Design a protein around this ligand. Structure first.
Ligand code: A1L89
Ligand code: MN
Ligand code: MN
Length: 269
C-alpha cells in the first residue's frame, strides 16, 4: 500500500499512532511525507531518526522548516526557541541525521501513479521537465560540501516570476520559494510571498496556486503539505492538501493512494 502523510512538525507520537492505525509495514508499504518533519512539535529528533531508518520505504520532500533546521545547524540562521530544535541539534547523531536530510529531494514523481509531490505544490508556471530540472539544481547545491552558502542565499522574497532566463541567486531563491513556501499566486502565476491565510480570507486578485491551470496539474495528481490554513479543504480534483495542522492542535492526515481512503490522528495537544 502507498500512504501519504502531511507535515509532521515533530509530532512523533501522532505519526506513529497514525502509522499503526494503517498497519504500515515497510517492505510491503511505502510512505510519502510532504516535508516539514521538524519544528514546533516536541519530537523532531525522534521523527528524523525514524524517517531516516525507513530507507527505500519512505519518499520524502524537503519543506521550509527542514531547510531552516539545516540553516541553523550550519550556523547560518538563529535558533528560535519556539521551534524546539535543540535536542535534535545537540544529539550525538545530529551530523548523520542532518547530512541525510540535506540529501533528500525537493520533488517526488511516480509515473505509474501519475503522482507528483512537493512541499508547497507545483507552481503553474512550471511544466514537469522544468520542475525536475529546478529540483535537481537545488538538490545539487544542498547535497554538496558547500551547502551553507546556498542556505544563506535562499532567504528572500524575490524574484517571484519564473523565467528560463533566471540565473544565479535569483534563480535558486525562486526555485526554493516555489517548492517550499508557495501558497497564493497572482493571475499570471507569479508568487505572492506574504499572505498565509485561507483562500476565502485572501485579498483579490490572489488565488491558490492550484486554482490556476498548469501543465503539471493538468496531467498529474499533486500531493502537498505546507498550507495549514487550507485545513486540507477546498482543492479541485487531483489536488491533495495533506497538511491539516497537527502541530497547531489540528490533526495529522494520512491518505492511502490505492483507495483514496483517509485516516486521521488527533493532535495530542
Ligand atoms: N487554521 C489556520 N488559520 C489561520 N492561520 C493558520 C492556521 N494554521 C496555521 N496558521 C498560521 O499560518 C502560518 C504558517 O504556518 P503553516 O503551518 O501554515 O506553514 P509553515 O509550517 O511552513 O510555517 P511558515 O513559515 O509561516 O510558512 P511559509 O513562510 O510560507 O514558509 C503560521 O504563522 C500559523 O500561525
Ligand atoms: Mn508546515
Ligand atoms: Mn511549510
Amino acid at each position: 500500500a502507498t500512504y501519504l502523510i502531511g507535515d509532521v512538525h515533530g509530532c512523533y507520537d501522532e505519526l506513529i499512532a497514525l502509522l499503526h492505525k494503517v498497519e504500515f509495514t515497510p517492505g510491503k508499504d511505502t510512505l510519502w511525507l510532504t516535508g516539514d518533519l521538524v519544528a514546533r512539535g516536541p519530537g523532531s529528533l525522534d521523527v528524523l531518526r525514524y524517517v531516516k531508518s525507513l530507507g527505500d520505504s519512505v519518499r520524502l520532500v524537503l519543506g521550509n522548516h527542514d531547510l531552516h533546521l539545516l540553516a541553523v545547524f550550519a550556523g547560518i540562521s538563529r535558533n528560535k526557541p519556539k521551534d524546539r530544535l535543540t535536542p535534535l541539534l545537540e544529539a550525538p547523531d545530529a551530523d548523520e541525521l542532518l547530512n541525510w536530510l540535506r540529501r533528500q529531494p525537493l520533488l517526488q514523481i511516480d509515473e505509474e501513479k501519475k503522482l507528483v509531490m512537493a512541499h508547497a505544490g507545483i507552481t503553474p508556471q512550471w511544466d514537469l521537465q522544468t520542475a525536475k530540472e529546478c529540483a535537481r539544481d537545488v538538490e545539487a547545491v544542498l547535497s554538496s560540501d558547500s551547502y551553507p552558502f546556498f542556505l544563506d542565499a535562499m532567504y528572500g522574497d524575490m524574484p517571484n516570476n519564473w523565467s528560463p532566463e533566471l540565473r544565479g541567486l535569483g534563480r535558486l531563491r525562486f526555485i526554493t520559494n516555489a517548492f517550499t513556501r508557495m501558497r497564493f499566486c497572482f493571475p499570471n502565476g507569479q508568487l505572492d510571498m506574504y499572505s498565509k491565510e485561507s483562500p476565502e480570507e485572501a485579498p483579490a486578485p490572489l488565488k491558490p496556486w492550484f486554482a490556476i491551470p498548469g501543465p503539471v496539474a493538468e496531467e498529474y495528481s499533486i500531493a502537498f503539505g505546507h498550507w495549514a490554513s487550507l485545513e486540507g479543504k477546498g482543492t479541485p480534483e487531483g489536488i491533495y492538501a495533506l497538511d491539516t495542522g497537527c502541530c497547531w492542535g489540528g490533526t495529522l492526515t494520512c491518505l492511502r493512494w490505492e483507495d483514496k481512503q483517509y485516516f486521521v490522528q488527533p493532535s495530542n495537544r
